[PDB]
Each structure stands twice: as structure tokens, then as C-alpha cells.
Short mmCIF file of all heavy atoms in Angstrom, two decimals:
data_model
loop_
_atom_site.label_atom_id
_atom_site.label_comp_id
_atom_site.label_asym_id
_atom_site.label_seq_id
_atom_site.Cartn_x
_atom_site.Cartn_y
_atom_site.Cartn_z
N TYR H 938 -13.64 9.94 -10.04
CA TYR H 938 -14.43 8.84 -9.50
C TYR H 938 -13.52 7.83 -8.81
O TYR H 938 -13.79 7.41 -7.68
CB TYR H 938 -15.23 8.18 -10.63
CG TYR H 938 -16.14 7.06 -10.19
CD1 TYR H 938 -16.48 6.89 -8.85
CD2 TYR H 938 -16.69 6.19 -11.12
CE1 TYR H 938 -17.33 5.87 -8.46
CE2 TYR H 938 -17.54 5.17 -10.73
CZ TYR H 938 -17.85 5.02 -9.40
OH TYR H 938 -18.70 4.00 -9.01
N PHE H 939 -12.43 7.44 -9.47
CA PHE H 939 -11.50 6.49 -8.87
C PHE H 939 -10.79 7.09 -7.67
O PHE H 939 -10.52 6.39 -6.69
CB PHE H 939 -10.49 6.03 -9.91
CG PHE H 939 -11.09 5.25 -11.04
CD1 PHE H 939 -10.29 4.81 -12.08
CD2 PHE H 939 -12.44 4.95 -11.07
CE1 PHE H 939 -10.83 4.10 -13.13
CE2 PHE H 939 -12.98 4.23 -12.11
CZ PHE H 939 -12.18 3.80 -13.14
N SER H 940 -10.46 8.38 -7.73
CA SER H 940 -9.83 9.02 -6.60
C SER H 940 -10.74 8.98 -5.38
O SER H 940 -10.30 8.62 -4.28
CB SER H 940 -9.46 10.46 -6.95
OG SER H 940 -8.44 10.50 -7.93
N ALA H 941 -12.01 9.31 -5.56
CA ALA H 941 -12.96 9.21 -4.46
C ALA H 941 -13.10 7.77 -3.99
O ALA H 941 -13.13 7.51 -2.78
CB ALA H 941 -14.32 9.77 -4.89
N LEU H 942 -13.17 6.83 -4.93
CA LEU H 942 -13.35 5.43 -4.57
C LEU H 942 -12.20 4.94 -3.70
O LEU H 942 -12.41 4.22 -2.72
CB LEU H 942 -13.48 4.59 -5.84
CG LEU H 942 -13.71 3.08 -5.66
CD1 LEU H 942 -15.11 2.81 -5.15
CD2 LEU H 942 -13.47 2.36 -6.97
N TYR H 943 -10.97 5.31 -4.05
CA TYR H 943 -9.80 4.81 -3.34
C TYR H 943 -9.46 5.63 -2.10
O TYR H 943 -8.75 5.13 -1.23
CB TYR H 943 -8.60 4.75 -4.28
CG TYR H 943 -8.59 3.49 -5.10
CD1 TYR H 943 -9.36 3.38 -6.25
CD2 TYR H 943 -7.84 2.39 -4.70
CE1 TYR H 943 -9.36 2.21 -7.00
CE2 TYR H 943 -7.84 1.23 -5.44
CZ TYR H 943 -8.60 1.14 -6.58
OH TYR H 943 -8.60 -0.02 -7.32
N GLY H 944 -9.93 6.87 -2.01
CA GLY H 944 -9.75 7.64 -0.81
C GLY H 944 -8.29 7.78 -0.44
O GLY H 944 -7.41 7.82 -1.30
N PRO H 945 -8.01 7.85 0.87
CA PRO H 945 -6.61 7.98 1.31
C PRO H 945 -5.69 6.89 0.77
O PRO H 945 -4.47 7.04 0.89
CB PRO H 945 -6.72 7.91 2.83
CG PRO H 945 -8.07 8.46 3.12
CD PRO H 945 -8.94 7.93 2.00
N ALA H 946 -6.23 5.82 0.21
CA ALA H 946 -5.41 4.75 -0.35
C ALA H 946 -5.03 5.00 -1.80
O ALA H 946 -4.35 4.17 -2.40
CB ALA H 946 -6.15 3.42 -0.23
N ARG H 947 -5.46 6.13 -2.38
CA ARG H 947 -5.12 6.42 -3.77
C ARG H 947 -3.62 6.30 -4.01
O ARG H 947 -3.18 5.77 -5.03
CB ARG H 947 -5.57 7.83 -4.15
CG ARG H 947 -7.07 8.03 -4.27
CD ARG H 947 -7.38 9.51 -4.19
NE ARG H 947 -7.34 9.99 -2.81
CZ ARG H 947 -8.40 10.38 -2.11
NH1 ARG H 947 -9.62 10.35 -2.61
NH2 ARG H 947 -8.22 10.80 -0.86
N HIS H 948 -2.82 6.79 -3.06
CA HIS H 948 -1.37 6.83 -3.18
C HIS H 948 -0.69 5.54 -2.72
O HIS H 948 0.54 5.48 -2.73
CB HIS H 948 -0.84 8.01 -2.37
CG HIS H 948 -0.99 7.84 -0.90
ND1 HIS H 948 -0.01 7.29 -0.10
CD2 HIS H 948 -2.02 8.14 -0.07
CE1 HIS H 948 -0.42 7.26 1.15
NE2 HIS H 948 -1.64 7.77 1.20
N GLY H 949 -1.45 4.53 -2.32
CA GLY H 949 -0.85 3.30 -1.83
C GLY H 949 0.04 2.63 -2.86
O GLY H 949 0.05 2.96 -4.05
N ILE H 950 0.81 1.66 -2.38
CA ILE H 950 1.73 0.88 -3.20
C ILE H 950 1.22 -0.55 -3.24
O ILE H 950 0.91 -1.14 -2.20
CB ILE H 950 3.17 0.94 -2.65
CG1 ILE H 950 3.67 2.38 -2.58
CG2 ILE H 950 4.11 0.12 -3.53
CD1 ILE H 950 4.90 2.57 -1.71
N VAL H 951 1.14 -1.11 -4.45
CA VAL H 951 0.62 -2.46 -4.63
C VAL H 951 1.74 -3.46 -4.35
O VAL H 951 2.77 -3.45 -5.03
CB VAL H 951 0.06 -2.66 -6.04
CG1 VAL H 951 -0.45 -4.08 -6.22
CG2 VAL H 951 -1.04 -1.64 -6.33
N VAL H 952 1.54 -4.32 -3.36
CA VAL H 952 2.47 -5.40 -3.08
C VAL H 952 1.66 -6.68 -2.92
O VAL H 952 0.96 -6.84 -1.91
CB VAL H 952 3.31 -5.11 -1.82
CG1 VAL H 952 4.27 -6.26 -1.54
CG2 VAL H 952 4.08 -3.81 -1.99
N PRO H 953 1.73 -7.62 -3.87
CA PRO H 953 0.85 -8.80 -3.79
C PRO H 953 1.07 -9.64 -2.55
O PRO H 953 0.19 -10.44 -2.21
CB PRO H 953 1.19 -9.58 -5.07
CG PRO H 953 2.54 -9.11 -5.47
CD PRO H 953 2.63 -7.68 -5.03
N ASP H 954 2.20 -9.50 -1.87
CA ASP H 954 2.50 -10.36 -0.73
C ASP H 954 2.08 -9.74 0.60
O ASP H 954 1.40 -10.39 1.39
CB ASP H 954 4.00 -10.66 -0.70
CG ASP H 954 4.45 -11.48 -1.89
OD1 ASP H 954 3.63 -12.27 -2.40
OD2 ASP H 954 5.61 -11.32 -2.32
N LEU H 955 2.50 -8.50 0.85
CA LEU H 955 2.26 -7.83 2.13
C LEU H 955 3.11 -8.45 3.23
O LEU H 955 3.08 -7.99 4.38
CB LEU H 955 0.78 -7.90 2.52
CG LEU H 955 -0.23 -7.45 1.46
CD1 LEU H 955 -1.60 -7.37 2.08
CD2 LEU H 955 0.16 -6.10 0.86
N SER H 956 3.88 -9.49 2.89
CA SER H 956 4.78 -10.12 3.84
C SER H 956 6.21 -9.60 3.73
O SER H 956 6.99 -9.78 4.66
CB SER H 956 4.79 -11.64 3.63
OG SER H 956 3.50 -12.18 3.87
N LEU H 957 6.56 -8.96 2.61
CA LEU H 957 7.88 -8.35 2.50
C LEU H 957 8.00 -7.16 3.43
O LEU H 957 9.09 -6.90 3.97
CB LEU H 957 8.13 -7.91 1.05
CG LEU H 957 8.56 -9.01 0.08
CD1 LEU H 957 7.37 -9.88 -0.30
CD2 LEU H 957 9.20 -8.41 -1.15
N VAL H 958 6.91 -6.42 3.64
CA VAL H 958 6.94 -5.27 4.52
C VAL H 958 6.76 -5.68 5.98
O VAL H 958 7.00 -4.86 6.87
CB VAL H 958 5.86 -4.25 4.13
CG1 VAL H 958 6.06 -2.94 4.87
CG2 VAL H 958 5.86 -4.04 2.62
N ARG H 959 6.30 -6.90 6.24
CA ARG H 959 6.02 -7.29 7.62
C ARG H 959 7.26 -7.21 8.52
O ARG H 959 7.14 -6.67 9.63
CB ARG H 959 5.41 -8.70 7.64
CG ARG H 959 4.81 -9.10 8.98
CD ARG H 959 3.69 -8.17 9.40
NE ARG H 959 2.92 -8.68 10.52
CZ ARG H 959 2.18 -7.93 11.33
NH1 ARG H 959 2.14 -6.62 11.21
NH2 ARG H 959 1.46 -8.52 12.28
N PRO H 960 8.44 -7.71 8.12
CA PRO H 960 9.62 -7.56 8.98
C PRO H 960 10.09 -6.12 9.07
O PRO H 960 10.42 -5.62 10.15
CB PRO H 960 10.68 -8.44 8.29
CG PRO H 960 9.92 -9.28 7.30
CD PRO H 960 8.76 -8.44 6.89
N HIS H 961 10.11 -5.43 7.93
CA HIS H 961 10.57 -4.05 7.86
C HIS H 961 9.64 -3.08 8.59
O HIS H 961 10.04 -1.94 8.84
CB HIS H 961 10.69 -3.63 6.40
CG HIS H 961 11.23 -2.25 6.21
ND1 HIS H 961 12.47 -1.85 6.66
CD2 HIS H 961 10.68 -1.15 5.62
CE1 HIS H 961 12.66 -0.58 6.36
NE2 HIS H 961 11.59 -0.14 5.73
N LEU H 962 8.43 -3.51 8.94
CA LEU H 962 7.43 -2.61 9.50
C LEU H 962 7.94 -1.93 10.77
O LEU H 962 7.79 -0.72 10.94
CB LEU H 962 6.15 -3.39 9.78
CG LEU H 962 4.85 -2.58 9.79
CD1 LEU H 962 4.53 -2.08 8.39
CD2 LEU H 962 3.73 -3.45 10.31
N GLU H 963 8.54 -2.71 11.68
CA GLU H 963 9.05 -2.12 12.91
C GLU H 963 10.12 -1.08 12.62
O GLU H 963 10.28 -0.11 13.37
CB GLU H 963 9.60 -3.20 13.84
CG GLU H 963 10.86 -3.89 13.31
CD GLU H 963 12.13 -3.16 13.72
OE1 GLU H 963 12.12 -2.47 14.76
OE2 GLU H 963 13.13 -3.26 12.98
N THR H 964 10.87 -1.26 11.53
CA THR H 964 11.95 -0.35 11.21
C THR H 964 11.43 1.00 10.72
O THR H 964 12.13 2.01 10.85
CB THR H 964 12.86 -0.97 10.15
OG1 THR H 964 13.08 -2.35 10.45
CG2 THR H 964 14.21 -0.24 10.11
N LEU H 965 10.22 1.04 10.18
CA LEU H 965 9.72 2.25 9.52
C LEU H 965 9.38 3.31 10.56
O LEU H 965 8.28 3.33 11.12
CB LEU H 965 8.50 1.92 8.66
CG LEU H 965 8.79 1.40 7.25
CD1 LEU H 965 7.50 1.02 6.55
CD2 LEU H 965 9.56 2.42 6.43
N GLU H 966 10.33 4.21 10.81
CA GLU H 966 10.09 5.42 11.57
C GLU H 966 10.07 6.67 10.71
O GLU H 966 9.50 7.69 11.12
CB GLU H 966 11.16 5.60 12.67
CG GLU H 966 11.18 4.49 13.71
CD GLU H 966 10.02 4.57 14.69
OE1 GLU H 966 9.19 5.50 14.56
OE2 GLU H 966 9.95 3.72 15.60
N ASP H 967 10.67 6.62 9.52
CA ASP H 967 10.71 7.73 8.58
C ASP H 967 9.79 7.37 7.41
O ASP H 967 10.23 6.78 6.42
CB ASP H 967 12.13 8.01 8.11
CG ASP H 967 12.20 9.14 7.11
OD1 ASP H 967 11.22 9.91 7.01
OD2 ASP H 967 13.23 9.26 6.42
N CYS H 968 8.52 7.71 7.54
CA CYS H 968 7.53 7.39 6.53
C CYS H 968 6.30 8.26 6.77
O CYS H 968 6.13 8.80 7.87
CB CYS H 968 7.15 5.90 6.57
SG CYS H 968 6.14 5.44 8.00
N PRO H 969 5.44 8.43 5.76
CA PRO H 969 4.21 9.20 5.97
C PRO H 969 3.39 8.61 7.11
O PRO H 969 3.31 7.40 7.28
CB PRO H 969 3.48 9.09 4.63
CG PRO H 969 4.17 7.99 3.88
CD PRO H 969 5.57 7.98 4.37
N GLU H 970 2.77 9.50 7.89
CA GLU H 970 2.06 9.08 9.10
C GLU H 970 1.08 7.95 8.82
O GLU H 970 0.72 7.22 9.75
CB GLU H 970 1.31 10.26 9.71
CG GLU H 970 0.05 10.65 8.95
CD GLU H 970 -0.64 11.86 9.56
OE1 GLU H 970 -0.19 12.32 10.63
OE2 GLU H 970 -1.64 12.32 8.98
N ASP H 971 0.63 7.80 7.57
CA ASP H 971 -0.32 6.75 7.21
C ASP H 971 0.10 6.17 5.86
O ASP H 971 -0.29 6.68 4.80
CB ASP H 971 -1.74 7.28 7.18
CG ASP H 971 -2.77 6.19 7.27
OD1 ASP H 971 -2.40 5.07 7.68
OD2 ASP H 971 -3.94 6.44 6.92
N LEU H 972 0.88 5.10 5.90
CA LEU H 972 1.29 4.41 4.69
C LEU H 972 0.23 3.40 4.27
O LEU H 972 -0.34 2.69 5.10
CB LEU H 972 2.63 3.70 4.91
CG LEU H 972 3.17 2.86 3.75
CD1 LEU H 972 3.36 3.71 2.50
CD2 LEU H 972 4.48 2.20 4.15
N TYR H 973 -0.05 3.36 2.97
CA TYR H 973 -1.07 2.48 2.41
C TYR H 973 -0.42 1.44 1.51
O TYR H 973 0.42 1.78 0.66
CB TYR H 973 -2.11 3.27 1.63
CG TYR H 973 -3.01 4.08 2.53
CD1 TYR H 973 -2.57 5.26 3.11
CD2 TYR H 973 -4.29 3.65 2.81
CE1 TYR H 973 -3.38 5.99 3.94
CE2 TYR H 973 -5.12 4.38 3.64
CZ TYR H 973 -4.66 5.54 4.20
OH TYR H 973 -5.48 6.26 5.04
N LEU H 974 -0.80 0.18 1.70
CA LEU H 974 -0.32 -0.93 0.89
C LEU H 974 -1.50 -1.77 0.45
O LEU H 974 -2.44 -1.99 1.22
CB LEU H 974 0.68 -1.79 1.66
CG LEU H 974 1.90 -1.04 2.18
CD1 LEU H 974 2.65 -1.90 3.19
CD2 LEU H 974 2.81 -0.64 1.03
N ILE H 975 -1.46 -2.23 -0.80
CA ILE H 975 -2.53 -3.03 -1.38
C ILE H 975 -1.91 -4.29 -1.95
O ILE H 975 -0.74 -4.31 -2.34
CB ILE H 975 -3.31 -2.25 -2.45
CG1 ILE H 975 -3.96 -1.01 -1.83
CG2 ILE H 975 -4.37 -3.13 -3.09
CD1 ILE H 975 -3.12 0.24 -1.95
N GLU H 976 -2.71 -5.35 -2.01
CA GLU H 976 -2.26 -6.66 -2.44
C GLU H 976 -2.83 -6.98 -3.81
O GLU H 976 -4.05 -7.00 -3.99
CB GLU H 976 -2.67 -7.72 -1.41
CG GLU H 976 -2.60 -9.14 -1.91
CD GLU H 976 -2.53 -10.13 -0.78
OE1 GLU H 976 -2.71 -9.72 0.39
OE2 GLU H 976 -2.30 -11.33 -1.04
N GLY H 977 -1.94 -7.21 -4.77
CA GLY H 977 -2.35 -7.67 -6.08
C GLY H 977 -1.20 -7.54 -7.05
O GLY H 977 -0.09 -7.11 -6.70
N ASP H 978 -1.48 -7.91 -8.29
CA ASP H 978 -0.46 -7.86 -9.33
C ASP H 978 -0.17 -6.41 -9.69
O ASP H 978 -1.06 -5.73 -10.22
CB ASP H 978 -0.93 -8.63 -10.57
CG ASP H 978 0.13 -8.66 -11.66
OD1 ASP H 978 1.19 -8.04 -11.48
OD2 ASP H 978 -0.12 -9.31 -12.70
N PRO H 979 1.04 -5.90 -9.45
CA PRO H 979 1.30 -4.50 -9.79
C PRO H 979 1.08 -4.17 -11.26
O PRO H 979 0.58 -3.08 -11.57
CB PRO H 979 2.77 -4.31 -9.39
CG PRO H 979 3.06 -5.40 -8.42
CD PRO H 979 2.21 -6.55 -8.85
N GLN H 980 1.42 -5.08 -12.17
CA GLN H 980 1.29 -4.79 -13.59
C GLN H 980 -0.17 -4.75 -14.02
O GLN H 980 -0.58 -3.86 -14.78
CB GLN H 980 2.06 -5.82 -14.41
CG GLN H 980 3.56 -5.66 -14.35
CD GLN H 980 4.15 -6.23 -13.08
OE1 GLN H 980 4.06 -7.43 -12.83
NE2 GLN H 980 4.76 -5.37 -12.27
N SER H 981 -0.96 -5.70 -13.55
CA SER H 981 -2.35 -5.84 -13.96
C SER H 981 -3.23 -5.97 -12.72
O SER H 981 -4.08 -6.85 -12.61
CB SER H 981 -2.52 -7.04 -14.88
OG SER H 981 -1.98 -8.22 -14.30
N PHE H 982 -3.01 -5.08 -11.75
CA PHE H 982 -3.74 -5.15 -10.50
C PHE H 982 -5.24 -5.10 -10.75
O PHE H 982 -5.73 -4.27 -11.52
CB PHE H 982 -3.33 -4.00 -9.58
CG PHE H 982 -4.16 -3.90 -8.34
CD1 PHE H 982 -3.93 -4.76 -7.28
CD2 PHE H 982 -5.18 -2.97 -8.24
CE1 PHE H 982 -4.70 -4.68 -6.14
CE2 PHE H 982 -5.95 -2.89 -7.09
CZ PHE H 982 -5.71 -3.75 -6.04
N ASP H 983 -5.96 -6.00 -10.09
CA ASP H 983 -7.41 -6.01 -10.15
C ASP H 983 -7.97 -5.05 -9.12
O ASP H 983 -7.53 -5.05 -7.96
CB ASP H 983 -7.95 -7.42 -9.89
CG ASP H 983 -7.36 -8.04 -8.64
OD1 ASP H 983 -6.34 -7.51 -8.13
OD2 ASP H 983 -7.90 -9.05 -8.16
#
């Protein structure tokens, strides 16, 4: 159920900021064609 709910984002990485990856984004040439990132507390993500 959760796998269906999260879809291609199932494998995403939780980063509460999303601003740490913002500078590095242009650098990312070696990464899965569709990287998923989510915002929240990694330990107790809602």
C-alpha cells in the first residue's frame, strides 16, 4: 500500500531543507535519471 502510495518516490531521500542539494544540483551528472528528494525529519518523517 505504501509502495503504491509513494510511487517512483518510494526510493527518495528525505532532506528537510532541500537547499543543501540546490547548489550541488548542477554538478549532478552521475545519478539516476530521476532522483527523488522529500522534505521532513529523517528520523520521524511525517
